[PDB]
């Protein structure tokens, strides 16, 4: 089998991407944030505290003839940005872009933090990291990808995120028309449950490439590119007037600036992030200070190749027995 679904930015800044997902019988379509940095599929639901729902589409398991309570199972997750959610669990039929999994754990939110409530366009998350990170207790549950894997033509999914435009998540096949040149594959460590890999270095604009190992994770659920402070300082030093602002929470730059590109290494290959991708606009409406798309990872504990990096590439998440990651230009 295969699946193919379009993923769409939630706003004009590409802050996140939503992908339609069919849950239950008859189908209830929810728009979920596909997140290669976590491993829970959870949704706003008829069980979510009423005051914490503001415009989201909810899953109502009582209206699904294939929904079954996973008795005794609960979940609770806290993300790196300080957001959180928790609840109980159903199993149900879940389809993404024509690919169907029966008996998928659908984690029903009873509680969500303010950041989720305030985002009316995101009806839940669909985790695509390794199932070892799944928070369901006392019986850990598998991701949609893990459940689908044996049935897929190939045990892979791909992320093809657009810049200020829709893109595509494919399951079970590699669309050879979707990228230019060749795909360069690189080793993955699953020791922390992430798609963790090591970039071979970086360049700023037309500058010389710096060969240096940068360990990080491929995370579609993170908006920006988080890299070591040395790297990030070298980038913003090429933008007149750019500075790190404690009050704002990162590097800002004059909105009148033209941003340089940023290149990162994948083995001997190079992925170029255009400067425009690194612009996240005025810090507040009408401000002439703009927020940077490359930020320091120093306060995170891990480097994160988020959407700013990933949208510059065609990315293969290879879930073979020994997983790997592939990057191509496009
Ligand atoms: C749950 N977050 C997305 C989100 C979606 C909607 C509202 C608020 C936040 C992020 C969070 O920031 C980085 C990391 O954790 C990421 N893997 C996760 O997807």
Swiss-Prot record:
Keywords: Aspartyl protease, Disulfide bond, Hydrolase, Protease, Signal, Zymogen. Disulfide bonds join 255-290. The active site is at 35, 199. GO terms for biological process: proteolysis. Its EC number is 3.4.23.22. It catalyses: Hydrolysis of proteins with specificity similar to that of pepsin A, prefers hydrophobic residues at P1 and P1', but does not cleave 14-Ala-|-Leu-15 in the B chain of insulin or Z-Glu-Tyr. Clots milk. GO terms for molecular function: aspartic-type endopeptidase activity. Residues 17-328 form the Peptidase A1 domain. Belongs to the peptidase A1 family. This is Endothiapepsin. It comes from Cryphonectria parasitica. The lineage of its organism: Eukaryota, Fungi, Dikarya, Ascomycota, Pezizomycotina. The gene is EAPA.
């Amino acid at each position: 089998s295969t699946g193919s679904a379009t993923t769409t930015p939630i706003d004009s800044l590409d802050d996140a991407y939503i992908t339609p997902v069919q849950i239950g019988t008859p189908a209830q379509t929810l728009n979920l944030d596909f997140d290669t940095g976590s491993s829970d599929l959870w949704v706003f639901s008829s069980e979510t505290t009423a005051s914490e729902v503001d415009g989201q589409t909810i899953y109502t398991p009582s209206k699904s003839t294939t929904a079954k309570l996973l008795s005794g199972a609960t979940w609770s997750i806290s993300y790196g940005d300080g957001s959180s959610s928790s609840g109980d669990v159903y199993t149900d039929t879940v389809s993404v872009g024509g690919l169907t999994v029966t008996g998928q754990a659908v984690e029903s939110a009873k509680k969500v933090s303010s950041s989720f409530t305030e985002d009316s366009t995101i009806d839940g998350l669909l985790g695509l990291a390794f199932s070892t990170l799944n928070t369901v207790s006392p019986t850990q549950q598998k991701t949609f990808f893990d459940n689908a894997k044996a049935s897929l033509d190939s045990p892979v999914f791909t992320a093809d995120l657009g810049y200020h435009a829709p893109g595509t998540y494919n399951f079970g096949f590699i669309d050879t028309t979707a990228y230019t040149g060749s795909i360069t594959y690189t080793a993955v460590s699953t020791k922390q449950g992430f798609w963790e890999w090591t970039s071979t270095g970086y360049a700023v604009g037309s500058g010389t490439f710096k060969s240096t190992s940068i360990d990080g994770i491929a995370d579609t659920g993170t908006t920006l590119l988080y890299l070591p402070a040395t790297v990030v300082s070298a980038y913003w030093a090429q933008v007149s007037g750019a500075k790190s602002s404690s009050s704002v929470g990162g590097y800002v730059f004059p909105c009148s600036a033209t941003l340089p590109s940023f290149t990162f290494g994948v083995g001997s290959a190079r992925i170029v992030i255009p400067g425009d991708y690194i612009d996240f606009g005025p810090i507040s409406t009408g401000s002439s200070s703009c927020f940077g798309g490359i930020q320091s990872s120093a306060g995170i504990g891990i480097n994160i190749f988020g959407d700013v990096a990933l949208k510059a590439a065609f990315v293969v998440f290879n879930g073979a027995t020994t997983p790997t990651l592939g990057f191509a230009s496009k």
